[PDB]
Design a protein around this ligand. Structure first.
Ligand SMILES: [Zn+2]
Ligand SMILES: [Zn+2]
Ligand SMILES: [Zn+2]
Ligand SMILES: [Zn+2]
Ligand SMILES: [Zn+2]
Lengths: 317, 318
């Protein structure tokens, strides 16, 4: 049974420490291995060093705390080794990629080798956003917007003290039109919100937040989403060439992208998804009585929206 | 078996990158180079084969090789070795394009991920192309623009003929990267020799080329900066080891590159070290002899706690 991997990202907030302190110490009933930057465990049961020098600590609550070098593969493979030998037991893996950490390279690690593809299965990317400092952090650091862009789910905290932050709701939507935004106004972040996002599965509803007309404000950010709607079918060969040219032109620019396509002559939905250079497609549920259409979303920095829309517009007969 | 010399070519895209790539793939220069790029500059493709990992490898008329990459760079690197061992292709230099928004970080880490890559490939250096006309603007808007400079072992500054008095730019590049020498590329094409033989990923004793001067106000302009640490006193090898390990872990996500020469208390040999992000290594070197012993270190990164770092090394004193 594949291990469910969750990436916890977002800028330096106080809420991240509280969440990590809850996984490592309290008894929540989850079997979680954690790769973090700091030190929140106050009850270390045992400890072992893997074949690749990975420091693996077993905690009293059953959970595991794990360190990482510059090569994440080492920690991942050492966790599997000691899992197979019954040294440790865990069902979920939570990796902290907060601060200046790029979620990109971490995601790609879980697709690098065949063994990691089979033994690990990415769940989703969770972006923690502090409503008080979000705008400032995103204005100064590109990586702050990027972490939001990679997210399958955005947890917006401290809105009770940030005041009227509807403008922030919009800005997150312009950056990431895929991820729903969860706004916790009273209480803390539930641990279960990190899991079962289904973010790395083929979706038919790729766009959660419908785009609104704000020309003078929808060009502020550097990372944005491009939502493309087609009410016409396209040739599977033609659209395949367009995508391959598109994904290569903006290779370094694209964070994540998903879409549902109406293929000319095919009675089934064609779904696709991708992260940077890695992309995959597959057929799905038949159209039936539902009116056929195409819906795609491209998240990235400095995307050539004009060229992208024009390319899809030329697929019309 | 001579380890293939790998060069990373970074910097914000422009006319200096396309012309340079078009010269490597087409013109006769005498280098046996394999190129991994994003575009398609070569015109005269001689032969083409597909690797066992679906790598598209093209042999060119000028002898050079053009290669494609998926999201996993290991695939192309291992397929190049496969067809090199089988005599299908021949090259002794590898040039990887990481221009635009590309982060040099993950690419650097690829060449340390596995033992085979450590022996067959040898990271020469990171070459950063800089447009004198647009540099200040790009660096103000994009953190990645400063980062690419921060990773550089050599900075090629171009379009200085159109920019003119780009002296304020020299200083800003120096504050960002105090390791890398700056080469003002004269008008025209960037010469191919400026990309090669930097010895950037070897242990150096002269870690700082551009010794920092006093420019307090302008030294708070960037997010990525260098911290030059000078010590005129020896340190306990255990004490300094604890300080570095705490430093590297505290600023794990922040550190781009770092190098240093250390005066170890009781040891007659120089201790050199170098690192890229989380990956770091140290080793002894040339003995001191008649040369006056001292320590010189440089830390390049974003939002570095300079105060804490200097204080930590200051506490290593007796
Ligand atoms: Zn821990
Ligand atoms: Zn090419
Ligand atoms: Zn690998
Ligand atoms: Zn100068
Ligand atoms: Zn001249």
């Amino acid at each position: 049974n594949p291990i469910a991997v969750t990436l916890l990202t977002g800028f330096l907030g106080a809420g991240k420490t509280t969440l990590l302190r809850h996984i490592l110490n309290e008894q929540h009933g989850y079997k979680i291995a954690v790769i973090e930057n700091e030190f929140g465990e106050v009850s270390v049961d045992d400890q072992l060093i893997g074949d690749r020098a990975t420091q693996i600590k077993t905690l009293t609550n059953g959970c595991i705390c794990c360190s990482r070098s510059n090569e994440l593969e080492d920690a991942l493979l050492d966790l599997l080794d000691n899992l197979d030998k019954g040294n440790i037991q865990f069902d979920r893996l939570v990796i902290e990629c907060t601060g200046m950490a790029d979620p990109g390279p971490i995601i790609q690690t879980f697709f690098s080798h065949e063994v990691l593809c089979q033994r690990y299965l990415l769940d989703g990317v969770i972006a923690l956003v502090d409503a008080v400092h979000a705008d400032e952090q995103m204005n100064q650091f590109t990586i702050a917007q990027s972490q939001v862009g990679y997210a399958d789910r955005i947890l917006l905290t401290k809105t009770d003290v940030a005041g009227e932050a509807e403008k922030l709701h919009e800005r997150l939507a312009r950056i990431n039109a895929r991820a729903p935004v969860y706004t916790v106004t009273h209480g803390d972040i539930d641990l279960g919100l990190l899991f079962n996002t289904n973010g790395f599965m083929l979706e038919e509803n790729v766009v959660s937040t419908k785009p609104r007309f704000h020309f003078i404000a929808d060009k502020q950010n550097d990372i944005s989403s491009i939502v493309v709607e087609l009410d016409y079918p396209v040739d599977i060969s033609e659209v395949s060439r367009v995508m391959e040219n598109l994904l290569l032109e903006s290779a370094d620019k694209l964070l994540r992208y998903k879409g549902m396509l109406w293929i000319d002559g095919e009675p089934n939905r064609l779904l696709f998804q991708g992260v940077q250079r890695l992309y995959s497609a597959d057929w799905d549920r038949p159209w039936g009585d539902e009116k056929p259409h195409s819906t795609m979303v491209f998240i990235g920095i400095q995307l050539p929206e004009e060229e992208i829309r024009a390319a899809f517009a030329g697929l019309r007969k």
